[PDB]
Enzyme design. Structure first.
Site: not given
Ligand SMILES: CN1C(=O)NS(=O)(=O)c2ccccc21
Ligand SMILES: [Zn+2]
Length: 257
Positions: A61, A91, A93, A103, A116, A195-196
């Site tokens: 992802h 990570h 996006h 996002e 993020h 957000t996922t």
């Molecule tokens: C997978 N993922 C995201 O893509 N964006 S996030 O909301 O910052 C996030 C936070 C915590 C765990 C997984 C997360």
């Molecule tokens: Zn994220």
């Protein structure tokens, strides 16, 4: 299973994850004229000097740079937060084109990408317990625009060839996430969600107003990653962003006038 394609993307997620239509979903559009300055918000405290990165993983992802979170080594405090939140991973996006990828949006503007930095509230003991709490996580969100290169991003860019496909990981020690921060820590904040999937409503979002600049070459290398595993048909990892969700009964607060 869920993804970012036509048949499994964000408009489908609610079937497996009904909270997708919940009351505090993320991301959101930040209407800068409606966000209210809150003088009671304190300055953010970002303490990353002892951060210990370990590994970088393509999870199908995005790619996560993971940190040792078994001690208070890299923590976020202050701002809207009560208590201490430990950095676990960061990570991004990003888009297929420079005109999309973030996002959160700002007055409907989309940035080329969004970073993020994910932190969990130490009073809940571990990340898995924290995500079950309304104040379990604090995510520091940072916009990326395309222009000059970000020198502190290059070490990330240069390892991506080694984690092209889903499930690949590589050692990634001694990376300093301070090199990803803009000058100003002015921010907007609101209560939201992952957000996922599983889209859990456990996040205090802290979105910095100042974007960082990255080069076209840097973001082009993000776009060479794959959603698929090795030996499967190639699907470029691009447009791995969820669009803005209804604000509902929430107020976005600004740390700055
Ligand atoms: C997978 N993922 C995201 O893509 N964006 S996030 O909301 O910052 C996030 C936070 C915590 C765990 C997984 C997360
Ligand atoms: Zn994220």
């Amino acid at each position: 299973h869920w993804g970012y394609g036509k048949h499994n993307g964000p408009e489908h997620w609610h079937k497996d994850f009904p909270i997708a239509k919940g009351e505090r979903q993320s991301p959101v559009d930040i209407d800068t004229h409606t966000a209210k300055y809150d003088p009671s918000l304190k300055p953010l405290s970002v303490s990353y000097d002892q951060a210990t990165s370990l590994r970088i993983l393509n999870n199908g992802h995005a790619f996560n740079v993971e940190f040792d979170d078994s001690q208070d080594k890299a923590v976020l405090k202050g701002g809207p937060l009560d208590g201490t939140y430990r950095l676990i991973q960061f990570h991004f996006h990003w888009g297929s084109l420079d005109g999309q990828g973030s996002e959160h949006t700002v007055d409907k503007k989309k940035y080329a990408a969004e970073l993020h930095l994910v932190h969990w509230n130490t009073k809940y003991g571990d990340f898995g317990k924290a995500v079950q709490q309304p104040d379990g996580l604090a995510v520091l969100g940072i916009f990326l625009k395309v222009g000059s290169a970000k020198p502190g991003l290059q070490k990330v860019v240069d390892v991506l060839d080694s984690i092209k496909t889903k499930g690949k990981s590589a050692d990634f020690t001694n990376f300093d996430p301070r090199g990803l921060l803009p000058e100003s820590l002015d921010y907007w904040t609101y209560p939201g969600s992952l957000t996922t999937p599983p889209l859990l409503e456990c996040v205090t979002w802290i979105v910095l107003k100042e974007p960082i600049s990255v080069s076209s070459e840097q973001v082009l290398k993000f776009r060479k990653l794959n959603f698929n595993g090795e030996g499967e048909p190639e699907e470029l990892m691009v447009d791995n962003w969820r669009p803005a969700q209804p604000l509902k009964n929430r107020q976005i607060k600004a740390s700055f006038k």
